[PDB]
Design a protein around this ligand. Structure first.
Ligand SMILES: CCCCCCCCCCCCCCCCCC(=O)OC[C@H](COP(=O)([O-])OCC(O)COP(=O)([O-])OC[C@@H](COC(=O)CCCCCCCCCCCCCCCCC)OC(=O)CCCCCCCCCCCCCCCCC)OC(=O)CCCCCCCCCCCCCCCCC
Ligand SMILES: CCCCCCCCCCCCCCCCCC(=O)OC[C@H](COP(=O)([O-])OCC(O)COP(=O)([O-])OC[C@@H](COC(=O)CCCCCCCCCCCCCCCCC)OC(=O)CCCCCCCCCCCCCCCCC)OC(=O)CCCCCCCCCCCCCCCCC
Ligand SMILES: CCCCCCCCCCCCCCCCCC(=O)OC[C@H](COP(=O)([O-])OCC[N+](C)(C)C)OC(=O)CCCCCCCCCCCCCCCCC
Ligand SMILES: CCCCCCCCCCCCCCCCCC(=O)OC[C@H](COP(=O)([O-])OCC[N+](C)(C)C)OC(=O)CCCCCCCCCCCCCCCCC
Ligand SMILES: CCCCCCCCCCCCCCCCCC(=O)OC[C@H](COP(=O)([O-])OCC[N+](C)(C)C)OC(=O)CCCCCCCCCCCCCCCCC
Ligand SMILES: CCCCCCCCCCCCCCCCCC(=O)OC[C@H](COP(=O)(O)OCCN)OC(=O)CCCCCCCCCCCCCCCCC
Ligand SMILES: CCCCCCCCCCCCCCCCCC(=O)OC[C@H](COP(=O)(O)OCCN)OC(=O)CCCCCCCCCCCCCCCCC
Ligand SMILES: CCCCCCCCCCCCCCCCCC(=O)OC[C@H](COP(=O)(O)OCCN)OC(=O)CCCCCCCCCCCCCCCCC
Ligand SMILES: CCCCCCCCCCCCCCCCCC(=O)OC[C@H](COP(=O)(O)OCCN)OC(=O)CCCCCCCCCCCCCCCCC
Ligand SMILES: Nc1nc2c(ncn2[C@H]2C[C@H](O)[C@@H](COP(=O)(O)OP(=O)(O)OP(=O)(O)O)O2)c(=O)[nH]1
Lengths: 165, 62, 95, 48, 164, 100, 35, 341, 368
């Protein structure tokens, strides 16, 4: 049910993202889309680690650059329209009552949670967020995360050169 | 006799060229031999990952 | 079918973000924000793929690192024209 | 002969090169929009 | 009905499948050219002249297609012979129709010569039995020593399959 | 899996990144496909090894099981809309909460 | 060896495009150091 | 382009990222390498002295990230349909993958960014663009088995890349349009072999190095600038301009060899009409190559008289004259070659 | 800048002088040998500008020997017409066609209305532009400052001066403006500019006092040409260069004193312009990093063929700057079959060179 609520909220924020043109308003629409995307990717998974990782990296880490650039880009304020708010509310109530009149068992995702797994599954009882993150720090896939940290340092070296400081 | 020898050499080269064209066509039709027309798909990385996952079962403990 | 009921919505919103990326009624900052919208939809679809497998979800912070470096690269490209094209280049409707 | 020959071939190629330079005087968003439509028909047929 | 090909039946056997096949090829070519037309050169504004340019660039190609197919069927059924000069007459007719859209008499024949040449070459392909774009019988996926080119540092674990 | 064009030292890290070999419901199916791709290669493995391909795709892709589930749920709703099944017997005996 | 390329011959290469039209005749050449 | 050691660092990391792309055994590690190559090719193609290079880097960024996200989306879609990287019967998701690769490579339905970006660059970043940056998409195109997309791309590349270079009098856009036509010969070789493509690409790369070194050492950006170029002996200017006839595919010089091997392998693969469509549309490429050769094939010109000394680099022109010799006398080495077979 | 009198001795270098005339400076040489380690207060570029009769060679010589810098002399067209072996190419004038003969400033002094004069000024620019980079290679690679009698920034004054008297057409102005707009943005502006002010009559007085045989009995130095150039200096070139370079007006109508202008130079504080990053003065020499300093040294010590190949503008619409093809052919057959320039310099065995069978040393920034 709440997965369908997040579907409806993402649809509504995407169509208002298509409608609006003010750059900080699109930045605000992105920062409120990232929360719903984080929660909706939290519904399929065993545990909410990667939603937290996407949260710190994308919203609190990266989009603040977008919010700063779009804040200094536009001198003017938002022109709030009650027509777009009314249309968003109408399509939101329509999509929630459409989720009310729809069977939620067929519309639920087939991806297993931590409790949707079998009871006799030995690997699920060990430690939360342990076996999924294991391949980051084991042979031979540790070279990718070493290359990722090197890639981030090289990215900073690129950014200092292209902005010319 | 020089022209006879050169014609014999060129005719035998023609037969070997036709035969290797036929052999290459039958090799590319079926992708059978391991020299040409063969894409080597290896499961070395899958076996390495399976051996690592079997090795980390012993490492599981306290 | 399976595609109609599962993972149909990330495709539709990906095409909507692609059309917002390339429309002539928008500007360069709107292109970059719609680009990070399709980055978010790509994360959604990639996580739906990666959760059919049990313990390969660690790839989600690899694509995150690459696309966040792409976004910082695009912002640093776009603001490098401030000292050359002026502060009015953000309102450019054409390239 | 030069019509259905080299002179008229050169004139037609010059006209085709002049009318293709008008394709390349547009913004990048038009060509990226053409790519987005080519993805769009390639995904409509995936439904069908 | 809409999946009918041009050569699923012999010449003069059915008309409607040939009209649908040649017209759907003309519609595909006209839409593919018109999508690159109205965004790049002579860009219109509004819903009406955009659809007008789409009709102006697609419908004449449909007229060329149906005129070539109709005079090809007329030249095939007017006699007992099924040969390449019926395709020559059809190419001349399609070039003459194209000329009318151009409004130039010279353009119509000049087009009919090349379309008749294309028609007799395609009828030669039908008669002799070869294809314009065949599948490749040979496709070199790589050169020699393709098994000894594995320059990898990782040691191979022992395989689970044998040849015995 | 894709055969890379070049086999350099730089494929050693990328190759192990995604694979059902780490504990999974049916990575032992995928191994039975993958060694088959060592036997016939990639292109003869598409033809001579088609039975082991469909089992792995059936297992992790979950295509026909979900299609059968949707066929069993849409037929029940069609019987509800056609008046054959109605009332408190619309849904059957539910499973126990620790059954699966 | 009697005719050599005159400046009239290299006049046609001096434009912004090889074959000017009503759109590209008002264009200007790029700077010769390409910056 | 060697003003800093950081650019050498970006060159070796873009080499590393391209090698990660072309050796990836999955469709996602190839995208990882594509992003590494993109990160290291954004600061090259950007400079402070040239104003157009920054907006050209913006065009490159938008074109590549549009192509890379469609490449990622279609690869994830393929993995969602069938969970192996290959596909038994080819479908529309491989078409979206190949179209996203063709936007990266610059095939003629998606090539309109290529000369429009090339109109404001230098001659060394162009050398990186038409040679090394064509490695990463084209080596992934060989993994797909659809024919009609390659057919449309080859046909459109050889007509559009040859006709569109006639109006251009700038040397960079003309070389970009010539590389678009030489791209189509590489994709026509990709449908029949994965080795004849390497032959054509290596010698096309060789011709690109030796021909873009003529315009980089002497700083030539225009067709009229070739007529005012001062060479102390006009026989040397006539000899140095034979690389255009070499790259156009003329039999005594090198550059006839890879085109001839493509002709030999396509006729053996029973594809005759597409070969005729390419070779009737490669004469226009030799026509705008011979329009460059107006400035050297005649033996005397109405030169501007203020410049009387030819100024040139030493190491770069020392590397140039080795490769100019093998561009026109390189057909003697066909007896030593064994990589055709 | 500190003089020798207050310092009590000669200046000391902060590092070893790089042999910039022998060894190239690429990025692999820029990894080891840094270039900001040898810079001090006496690393400025000083241009001593003035009218044509003012004493500037003697003043620049005593300023170079007083401030411990290197004096770069004024350019003259003997540098083209005399090769490296010392042979004069003015003796090839009967062999050359009359549209391609020699034209030095002596031929300008007697015949200013000749068609080669519009070439001649451009040639003068090609000797100022080639000198300043040769000045800049002394600043960045050795750390010693340079002083120049003439600069390429001030060469357009002579161009409009010959235009106003009527010696140049409008097309010559257009092609010189195109060459200047193509080239002047690639070299760093000087730190300091000295203008030795002279009235128009005292210039004529010093011209007749010098008694050079082509300056006398020449109609070029009238009361309009000298007045045009001294006006054009102070209201175009000085106003352009004062945004970057410090400008010192000195009343040189007397004999002129040297210690007072060294005192006037020494009270100028050179560190106050580096406080503001976006300041217009000394903007071209404001390199915040060592990598930008090494890039600036690479641009003039290694990329001088690029800046000399930037003179490749095609402009064929002028008839007096286009060498005809038969005249160009016989000019090549005369000039490049000379004893001096049959081959490249250092490899001509006809004029006394030995050991050519084992010699593969080209040289650095050598005209071919
Ligand atoms: C039974 C039926 C009875 C009749 C019902 C009739 C309904 C339709 C007519 C009313 C209507 O929608 O008018 C449109 C009329 C026009 O609004 P708009 O121009 O489309 O957009 C609003 C402005 O941008 C707003 O510009 P602004 O910045 O001046 O707004 C002042 C702000 C002042 O806000 C407040 O005082 C709210 C205080 C904080 C609230 C909590 C945070 C939010 O007012 C609001 O935000 C209103 C809510 O909107 C209202 O009257 C808003 C209230 C309803
Ligand atoms: C064999 C060569 C030696 C013998 C022939 C020598 C030349 C003879 C020329 C002649 O007799 O012209 C008579 C006649 C002269 O007409 P006119 O009275 O001067 O002009 C009145 C109209 O403006 C005429 O209307 P229009 O011609 O503008 O209308 C049709 C036109 C409409 O197109 C346009 O107006 C320009 C469109 C853009 C052109 C550039 C981009 C093309 C992209 C490729 C599209 C097709 C690709 C193939 C299919 C791909 C998908 C599978 O489309 C085309 O012509 C298609 C040309 C496609 C390129 C072919 C390049 C050579 C390939 C080998 O021209 C024709 O009949 C045109 C048909 C084609 C004749 C040959 C053209 C060769 C170039
Ligand atoms: C639910 C609230 C929706 C608010 C909204 O869309 O306002 C429209 C405005 C649109 O701003 P705008 O100035 O871009 O308007 C262009 C769009 N039209 C003309 C169609 C209205 O958005 C905002 O004010 C954003 C507020 C923050 C949203 C998070
Ligand atoms: C107007 C429409 C223009 C575009 C039409 C494209 C049609 C197409 O792709 O057809 C595929 C077909 C593919 O041909 P094919 O040889 O593969 O046909 C075999 C068809 N099956 C498998 C059903 C048996 O292309 C052609 O028919 C091309 C014919 C070209 C004829 C003219 C050649 C000479 C031209 C001289 C100028
Ligand atoms: C210089 C090196 C260029 C790159 C070629 C590297 C290499 O070993 O290629 C192997 C290839 C052999 O092809 P291959 O068999 O490795 O191809 C890969 C095949 N699959 C995709 C199935 C794995 O060598 C050549 O094709 C010869 C190229 C010669 C280039 C220089 C000519 C002089
Ligand atoms: C019937 C056989 C016709 C054969 C024609 C061969 C092409 C030819 O000869 O073209 C000549 C043309 C150069 O003509 P030119 O003399 O430069 O023109 C003067 C200004 N109109 O040169 C060109 O047009 C160059 C391009 C030729 C393209 C040939 C293939 C077209 C498909
Ligand atoms: C863009 C690049 C150039 C494209 C050139 C297209 C040339 C025509 C073509 O290839 O058409 C494809 C197709 C007809 O070809 P075919 O494969 O026979 O169709 C099978 C139908 N099931 O065409 C069609 O199927 C088109 C059918 C009509 C579509 C529009 C309907 C309104
Ligand atoms: C929406 C209305 C218009 C729909 C037009 C649909 C055209 C494509 C029809 C089709 O089925 O194309 C697929 C086909 C290749 O598929 P197929 O041959 O069946 O099997 C693979 C082995 N050859 O053929 C191809 O992939 C070749 C290209 C077919 C025609 C392309 C038409 C392009 C339409 C305009 C696009 C303009 C740019 C954006
Ligand atoms: C479609 C043609 C519309 C009218 C164009 C103007 C008149 C052209 C006359 C000659 C047309 C070719 C002969 C008739 C024919 O069979 O046309 C259909 C053909 C494709 O049909 P088919 O070979 O069955 O391909 C099935 C592939 N799935 O299609 C073709 O061969 C394409 C048309 C010929 C080549 C382009 C035009 C000449 C250059
Ligand atoms: N046409 C032309 N003549 C020039 C140019 N530069 C200098 N001259 C001529 C004009 C005068 O005859 C003479 C200028 O004299 P200088 O500036 O060399 O000074 P001079 O040597 O007289 O004194 P000084 O060395 O400064 O003490 O050379 C130039 O760019 N163009």
């Amino acid at each position: 049910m709440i997965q369908l609520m997040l579907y409806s909220l993402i649809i509504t924020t995407s169509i208002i993202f298509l409608n609006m043109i003010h750059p900080l308003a699109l930045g605000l629409t992105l920062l409120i889309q990232t929360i719903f995307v984080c929660l909706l990717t939290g519904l399929m998974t065993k545990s909410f680690w990667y939603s937290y990782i996407l949260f710190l990296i994308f919203l609190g880490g990266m989009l603040v650059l977008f919010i700063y650039v779009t804040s200094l880009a536009s001198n003017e304020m938002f022109n709030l329209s009650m027509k777009l708010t009314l249309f968003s509310s109408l399509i939101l109530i329509f999509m929630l009552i459409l989720s009310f009149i729809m069977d939620k068992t067929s519309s639920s995702l087939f991806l297993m949670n931590n409790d949707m797994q079998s009871i006799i599954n030995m690997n699920s009882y060990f430690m939360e967020n342990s076996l999924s993150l294991n391949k980051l720090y084991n042979f031979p896939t540790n070279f990718i995360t070493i290359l990722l940290m090197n890639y981030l340092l090289i990215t900073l070296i690129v950014i200092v050169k292209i902005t010319k400081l | 006799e020089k022209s006879l020898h050169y014609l014999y050499e060129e005719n035998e080269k023609a037969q070997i060229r036709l035969l290797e064209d036929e052999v290459r066509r039958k090799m590319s039709e079926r992708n059978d031999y391991q020299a040409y027309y063969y894409r080597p798909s290896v499961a070395k990385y899958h076996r390495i990952s399976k051996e690592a996952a079997d090795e980390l079962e012993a490492l599981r403990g306290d | 079918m399976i595609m109609i009921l599962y993972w149909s919505l990330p495709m539709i919103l990906f095409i909507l973000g692609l059309f917002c990326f390339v429309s002539n009624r928008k500007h360069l900052l709107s292109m970059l924000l719609s680009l990070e919208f399709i980055v978010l939809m790509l994360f959604f679809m990639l996580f739906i793929y990666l959760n059919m497998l049990n313990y390969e979800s660690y790839f989600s912070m690899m694509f995150l690192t690459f696309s966040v470096c792409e976004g910082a690269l695009g912002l640093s490209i776009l603001v490098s024209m401030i000292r050359t094209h002026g502060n009015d280049y953000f309102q450019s409707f054409s390239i | 002969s030069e019509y259905f020959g080299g002179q008229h071939l050169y004139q037609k190629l010059s006209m085709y090169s002049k009318t293709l330079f008008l394709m390349h005087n547009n913004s990048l968003k038009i060509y990226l929009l053409l790519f987005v439509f080519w993805i769009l028909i390639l995904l409509i047929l995936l439904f069908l | 009905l809409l999946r009918s090909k041009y050569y699923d039946h012999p010449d003069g056997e059915d008309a409607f499948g040939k009209i649908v096949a040649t017209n759907k090829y003309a519609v595909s070519a006209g839409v593919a050219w018109s999508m690159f037309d109205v965004l790049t050169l002579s860009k219109p504004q509004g819903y009406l002249p955009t659809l007008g340019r789409f009709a102006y660039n697609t419908g004449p190609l449909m007229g060329m297609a149906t005129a070539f197919t109709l005079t090809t069927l007329v030249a095939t059924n007017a006699r007992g012979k099924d040969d390449k000069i019926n395709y020559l007459i059809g190419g001349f007719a399609a070039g003459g129709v194209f000329g009318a859209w151009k409004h130039n008499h010279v353009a119509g024949l000049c087009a009919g010569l090349f379309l008749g040449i294309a028609g007799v070459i395609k009828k030669m392909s039908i008669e002799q039995g070869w294809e314009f774009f065949p599948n490749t019988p040979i496709k070199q996926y790589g050169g020699l020593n393709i098994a000894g080119n594995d320059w990898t540092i990782m040691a191979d674990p022992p395989k689970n399959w044998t040849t015995e | 899996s894709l055969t890379p064009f070049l086999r350099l030292p730089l494929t050693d890290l990328t190759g192990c990144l995604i694979n059902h070999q780490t504990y999974d419901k049916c990575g032992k199916f995928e191994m039975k496909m993958m060694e088959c791709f060592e036997a016939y290669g990639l292109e003869r493995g598409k033809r001579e090894c088609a039975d082991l391909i469909s089992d792995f795709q059936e297992c992790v892709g979950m295509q026909k099981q979900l299609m059968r589930f949707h066929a069993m749920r849409n037929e029940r709703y069609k019987q509800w809309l056609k008046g054959e099944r109605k009332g408190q017997e619309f849904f059957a005996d539910p499973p126990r909460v620790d059954a699966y | 060896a009697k005719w050599y390329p005159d400046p009239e011959f290299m006049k046609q290469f001096s434009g912004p495009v090889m074959y000017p039209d009503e759109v590209t005749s008002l264009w200007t050449v790029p700077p010769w150091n390409s910056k | 382009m060697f003003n800093n050691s950081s650019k050498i660092l970006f060159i070796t990391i873009m080499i590393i990222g391209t090698l990660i792309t072309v050796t990836s055994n999955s469709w996602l590690g190839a995208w990882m390498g594509l992003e590494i190559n993109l990160l290291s090719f954004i600061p090259l193609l950007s400079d402070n002295n040239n104003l157009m290079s920054t907006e050209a880097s913006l065009k490159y960024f938008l074109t590549q990230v549009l192509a890379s996200t469609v490449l990622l989306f279609s690869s994830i879609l393929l993995m969602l349909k069938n969970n192996m990287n290959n596909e038994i019967n080819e479908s529309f998701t491989s078409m979206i993958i190949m179209s996203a690769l063709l936007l990266k490579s610059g095939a003629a339905p998606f090539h309109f960014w290529f000369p429009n970006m090339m109109e404001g660059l230098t001659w060394m970043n162009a050398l990186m663009l038409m040679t090394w940056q064509k490695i990463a998409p084209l080596m992934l195109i060989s993994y797909l088995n659809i024919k009609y997309l390659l057919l449309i791309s080859v046909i459109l590349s050889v007509i559009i890349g040859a006709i569109g270079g006639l109006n251009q009098t700038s040397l960079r856009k003309l070389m970009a349009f010539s590389s678009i036509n030489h791209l189509g010969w590489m994709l026509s070789s990709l449908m029949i072999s994965e080795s004849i493509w390497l032959i054509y690409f290596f010698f096309y790369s060789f011709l690109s190095f030796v021909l873009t070194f003529m315009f980089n050492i002497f700083k030539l950006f225009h067709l009229n600038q070739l007529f005012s170029w001062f060479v102390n002996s006009k026989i040397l200017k006539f000899t140095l301009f034979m690389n255009f006839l070499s790259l156009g595919g003329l039999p005594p010089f090198l550059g006839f060899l890879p085109k001839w091997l493509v002709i030999q392998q396509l006729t053996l693969c029973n594809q005759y009409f597409m070969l005729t469509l390419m070779m009737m549309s490669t004469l226009i490429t030799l026509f705008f190559y011979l329009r460059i050769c107006y400035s050297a094939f005649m033996m005397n010109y109405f030169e501007n008289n203020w410049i009387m000394k030819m100024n040139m680099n030493s190491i770069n022109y020392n590397m140039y004259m080795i490769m100019t010799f093998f561009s026109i006398f390189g057909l003697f080495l066909i007896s030593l070659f064994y990589f055709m077979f | 800048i500190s003089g020798k009198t207050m310092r009590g001795g000669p200046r000391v270098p902060k590092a070893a002088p790089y042999p910039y005339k022998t060894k190239k400076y690429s990025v692999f040489n820029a990894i080891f040998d840094k270039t900001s380690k040898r810079f001090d207060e006496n690393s400025k570029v000083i241009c001593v500008e003035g009218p044509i009769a003012a004493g500037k060679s003697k003043f620049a010589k005593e300023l170079a020997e007083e401030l411990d810098m290197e004096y770069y002399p004024a350019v003259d067209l003997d540098l083209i017409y005399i090769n490296s072996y010392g042979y004069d190419m003015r003796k090839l004038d009967p062999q050359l066609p009359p549209s391609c003969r020699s034209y030095d400033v002596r031929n300008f002094c007697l015949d200013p209305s000749h068609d080669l004069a519009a070439q001649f000024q451009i040639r003068m620019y090609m000797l100022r532009y080639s000198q300043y980079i040769d000045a800049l290679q002394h600043v960045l690679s050795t750390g010693q400052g340079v002083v120049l009698e003439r600069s390429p920034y001030s060469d357009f004054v002579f161009m409009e001066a010959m235009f106003r008297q009527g010696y140049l057409s409008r097309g010559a102005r257009s092609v010189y403006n195109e060459l200047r707009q193509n080239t002047i943005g690639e070299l760093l502006k000087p730190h300091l500019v000295i203008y030795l002010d002279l009235p128009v009559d005292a210039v004529k007085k010093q011209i007749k006092a010098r008694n050079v045989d082509y300056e006398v009995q020449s109609k070029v130095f009238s009361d309009a040409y000298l007045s045009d150039l001294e006006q054009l200096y102070k209201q175009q070139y000085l106003k352009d260069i004062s945004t970057h370079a410090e400008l010192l007006i000195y009343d040189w109508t007397a004999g002129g004193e040297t210690e007072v202008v060294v005192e006037d130079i020494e009270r100028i504080d050179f560190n106050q312009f580096e406080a503001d990053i976006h300041n217009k003065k000394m903007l071209d020499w404001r390199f915040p990093l060592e990598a930008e300093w090494c890039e600036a040294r690479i641009k003039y010590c290694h990329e001088k063929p690029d800046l000399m190949n930037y003179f490749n503008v095609p402009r064929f619409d002028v008839p007096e700057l286009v060498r005809s093809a038969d005249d160009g052919k016989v000019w090549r057959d005369v000039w490049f079959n000379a004893p001096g320039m049959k081959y490249r310099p250092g490899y001509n065995a006809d004029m006394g060179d030995e050991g050519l069978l084992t010699k593969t040393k080209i040289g650095i920034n050598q005209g071919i």
